[PDB]
Design a protein around this ligand. Structure first.
Ligand SMILES: NCCCCCCOP(=O)(O)OC[C@@H](O)[C@@H](O)[C@@H](O)COP(=O)(O)OC[C@@H](O)[C@@H](O)[C@@H](O)COP(=O)(O)OC[C@@H](O)[C@@H](O)[C@@H](O)CO
Ligand SMILES: NCCCCCCOP(=O)(O)OC[C@@H](O)[C@@H](O)[C@@H](O)COP(=O)(O)OC[C@@H](O)[C@@H](O)[C@@H](O)COP(=O)(O)OC[C@@H](O)[C@@H](O)[C@@H](O)CO
Ligand SMILES: [Mg+2]
Ligand SMILES: [Mg+2]
Ligand SMILES: [Mg+2]
Lengths: 608, 573
């Protein structure tokens, strides 16, 4: 019949139909025609009656196929079996707790088909954090495998894989024994077999939801199992990745992230029993599997960690974790205002311990050094605590997050400046300033994005530290704008962080702007009541439909009178027109406007 | 009889727990209660089982009377200290230092130094006017001073103390010992402002000396009338605001003379002017502009030296300890930053801070976490500077140095072993920020000074705490142990465990113990063994004494000094 573009494989196990409502809805709302994709659910031997109800459900959907296998224990064998019965050109591994954005299938397929891609690595979104794949999802790239294996990071399985490519190269998930980071093996095997990879960065494709339920299995908490799994992963890299630059990247990335990653604040969150266990494991892994040259790919602080790890100097690493504890960079709002159709920010930041006192580096002779106790300084190669060659590698960038979609984006076009300032004696602090503007239409991709609160954040990097935190301000900030049929309010939110409310999802634009009460005009021939807004930045033409409620003054149990109202922006002024029209009214009346589902508390009263 | 404890009857042993532990002779004080109540009194030789408080006042036979409340406690040496202070100075009222659960101060200005003749300072001496003072019974009956009857009026203790002073009360302040701990466990808007009118009318009708009237008017107009023109406006609905604002307007016009505004700071003169105008819209906006102004002190350096703990702190006026608080220079005056829509409505000098830039204060304080008593750290040095940051914007920055001698605050035996919390108090431009001293980096420093273990540290909240006596933390743990430096003598049965980093000063001998478990075997019964913490000649060490059991091999040695075990992984061969 008609060729299938996309096969969505979803493993299940004791999965109630109610737990699939959001998933099924996100698939049903795909712009792609439903006879061009298929769903392949494979049940991992459920013991309850959830499989029966799944098969009954699938009887009403011709593009949905449902199968059950003997219980294997995890979703690898369900994914593999679903893959062998899929018919689509591309396969998406969609976990049943996750959802897909409405234009994903169309955009991903068109991108993969036009560029003959074997893997489409689409922008993935996560519930928490201010970024995901910040480096890799930076621009669309149809030839991303030219960058080497890093084009597949983050190595989740939530990409679109060309089915014939998986089958031709026998790329499958491991279903013989549970392994950690199974998706890292899967994506590595794809790259090793010469996959053409494309990165689709301009549209969120996949939403990996954080459920809050814990994988509280003894398998994932066993420290001996953990380091057995890390040994297996590094031996997999060394045995199978032949291109030197790809092997060295994987060895560096994973040594830094999961091996040296236990040598910082992890040392302050664990007891000596588990520290000694995991530390001895890491020392053995560095010696046996990690070439000594890898350490030259690392930043200064990681070179110190690698050095002391190989020395077995756990006591110094513990002391260094105490000295490093709390280093951060939080941005303060210096200025915020609307100009034309955009919102402008001036921000400032400096490196601190937990937004308190200054973080310092020390100038000795002609080199800027890390402030360390003399016992540790004399134990290290001198270059490792010399920041001199790193004082020009600071970055300071802004970012935004949709509070409903959870999509995160870099705000482009910013200018920033980071200075190393001599505070006192030979101590130097790190100060930064940034200017940027927000054109909210750059981030409105789905219709739901038009009414959303947006949260603003800054990303500061330098000296090996990365601080991506929300933008904040201390004083109360409330500023409003009416820009080309968009209500916009920038404000200090309830957590003390900077937000932009578009579409009255959180705040009332009438209440936040104020009402020139003495400038209210009543036209008794047309029934129009004009209510001009006080403090608001108006750009372009705007007409927001709403309504208003009238109740007579004095009557306690008065019945409301509902009429149509309009928020109008023209000639850089804003007003609410309440259309009484033909209604017969007399006396004084309360007036409460209801624009975009928010009511004002301006105590407006009119007399007819 | 020396002291009579009046108690408003309400539903007993809880109330008597703090009373029975008084150092004064129990037959020198009595307790006045006004079927189980008979059973309780007949077994006590000193018990005698607003209107009930007046009856108990007449019938008491003690020289002084304390009006104790439920849940409120009294420190174990209060009775004998207050009586000797009053009788020797022939005092009619003893305004002893009062302790409250939360906050970093209470009676900061009044409880700063003892004053046996404090009545000469004016009516200000009785602040705070809580009913928790000691009143001479012969003076109360002489001037017929009683609690107001016939109505549940608010600020009853304000009337009571004002009646005492206006009758020439001989009052003295006892600030060197905490006397009364107040636990404290009319919301209708028309009732509130009816009661506020009563209090102000009581001032103008009964206070005869002008110096005391102007103070009481000022202190109460500032705190309870203008007190609703700040952050209060941001925490109430428009209906409630409109009601109380019109009451406050009426009370200012009808009862508060104009010359009271001259005694107010700039920001309070602004609120007074706009209140009398009825400009509620501007007071609302001003409340948004003022919100969050504070001054938090960071720690710049902290270290022990000799027998004291030294601190170096810094602060800056901020909004919520984020961006800087600014003031603006226009011509030759430092103006408060305001919108021109409000600047023009105001008398131009009410937002000019020029004459106030020499009045910044910056002082440190301490507080006991268990006793909840607060003290000012005597002998501090501080400096405040108005610095131009950019363009004509000026910020307010300060620095301070001080030291802590923990013996200055040890009064009860329970103070020897309790945590302490350090704080700073920064006033200026009408604002007052008394907040905990904070630090961002991990700070852990130890000391063994004259049989006192001391640990200054950043606690889980990021605030500076001082643990004296291993009440929360282990001295051995935070000091460190050099396992590569242990000394073991099997003949004498003595294991010498030195301490890594610690400030030792004087001679110290803390009696402790330890525990031994064989290295390898995991379910052997624990062997408890006595030990000692020794501090001598600028060095500390723990000496364990073993020679009652036989042992050979590797053992786990866990110290237990003052009930705090270490986690230093000590193994002995
Ligand atoms: O914020 P940023 O955008 O800067 O960076 C955040 C991530 O992009 C960064 O961590 C990437 O390098 C992560 O990609 P990787 O391939 O290393 O790791 C692969 C794993 O995340 C993947 O196997 C997950 O399934 C692991 O699950 P969890 O263990 O539950 O997390
Ligand atoms: O922080 P500080 O220690 O500076 O201030 C602590 C107090 O001295 C300060 O609040 C004073 O203004 C209090 O003195 P008063 O106005 O008599 O207040 C009387 C009330 O305490 C008393 O009547 C209570 O029953 C009212 O709740
Ligand atoms: Mg079907
Ligand atoms: Mg700060
Ligand atoms: Mg109480």
């Amino acid at each position: 019949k008609k060729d299938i573009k996309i096969s969505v494989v979803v493993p299940t196990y004791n999965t109630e139909l109610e737990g699939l409502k959001n998933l099924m809805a996100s698939i049903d709302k795909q712009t792609m025609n439903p006879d061009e994709y298929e769903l392949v659910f494979v049940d991992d031997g459920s013991t309850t009656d959830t499989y029966e109800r799944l098969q009954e459900f699938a009887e009403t959907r011709p593009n949905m196929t449902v199968k059950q296998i003997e219980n294997s224990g995890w979703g690898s064998r369900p994914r593999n079996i679903a893959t062998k019965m899929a018919k689509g050109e591309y396969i998406l591994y969609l976990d049943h707790d996750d959802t897909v954005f409405p234009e994903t299938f169309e955009r991903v397929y068109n991108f993969g088909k036009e560029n003959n891609l074997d893997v489409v690595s689409g922008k993935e979104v996560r519930t928490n954090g201010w970024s995901w794949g910040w480096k890799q999802f930076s621009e669309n790239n149809p030839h991303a495998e030219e960058m080497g294996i890093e084009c597949l990071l983050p190595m989740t399985p939530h990409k679109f894989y060309k089915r014939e490519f998986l089958l031709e190269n026998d790329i499958t998930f491991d279903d013989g024994a549970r392994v950690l980071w199974e998706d890292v093996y899967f994506n590595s095997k794809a790259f090793i077999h010469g996959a053409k990879v494309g990165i689709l960065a301009d549209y969120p494709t996949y939403y990996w939801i954080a459920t809050g339920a814990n994988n509280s299995s003894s398998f994932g908490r066993d420290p001996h199992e953990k380091w057995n799994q890390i040994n297996k992963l590094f031996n997999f890299f060394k045995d199978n990745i032949k291109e030197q630059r790809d092997l060295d990247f994987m060895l560096t990335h994973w040594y830094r992230s999961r091996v040296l990653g236990i040598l910082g604040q992890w040392l302050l969150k664990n007891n000596n029993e588990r520290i000694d266990i995991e530390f001895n494991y890491a020392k053995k892994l560095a010696e046996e599997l990690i070439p000594a040259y890898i350490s030259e790919n690392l930043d200064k602080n990681n070179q110190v960690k690698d050095y002391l790890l190989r020395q077995g100097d756990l006591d110094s690493l513990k002391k260094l974790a105490q000295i490093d504890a709390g280093i951060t960079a939080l941005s303060y709002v210096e200025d915020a205002y609307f100009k034309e159709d955009k919102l402008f920010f001036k921000t400032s930041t400096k490196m601190t311990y937990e937004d308190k006192e200054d973080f310092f580096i020390e100038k000795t002779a002609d080199r800027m050094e890390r402030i360390l106790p003399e016992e540790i300084k004399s134990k290290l190669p001198k270059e490792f605590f010399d920041y001199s060659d790193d004082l020009a590698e600071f970055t300071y960038e802004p970012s935004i997050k949709g509070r409903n979609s959870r999509a995160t984006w870099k705000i482009d076009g910013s200018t920033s400046n980071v200075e190393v300032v001599n505070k006192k004696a030979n101590l130097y602090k790190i100060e930064g300033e940034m200017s940027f503007s927000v054109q909210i239409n750059d981030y409105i991709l789905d219709a739901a994005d038009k009414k959303q609160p947006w949260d603003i954040a800054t990303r500061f990097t330098g000296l090996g530290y990365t601080s991506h935190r929300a933008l904040t301000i201390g004083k109360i900030l409330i500023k409003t704008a009416l820009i080309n049929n968009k209500t916009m309010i920038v404000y200090k939110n309830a957590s003390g962080l900077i937000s932009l409310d578009v579409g009255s999802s959180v705040r009332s634009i009438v209440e936040d702007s104020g009402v020139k009460r003495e400038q209210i005009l009543i036209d008794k021939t047309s029934g129009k009541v004009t209510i001009p807004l006080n403090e608001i930045h108006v750009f372009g033409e705007s007409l927001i439909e709403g309504n208003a409620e009238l109740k007579p003054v004095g009557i306690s149990d008065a019945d409301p009178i509902n009429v149509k109202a309009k928020l109008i922006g023209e000639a850089n002024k804003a007003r609410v027109e309440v259309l009484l029209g033909d209604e017969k009214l007399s006396g004084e009346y309360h007036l409460v406007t209801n624009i975009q589902g928010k009511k004002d508390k301006q105590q407006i009263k009119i007399t007819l």
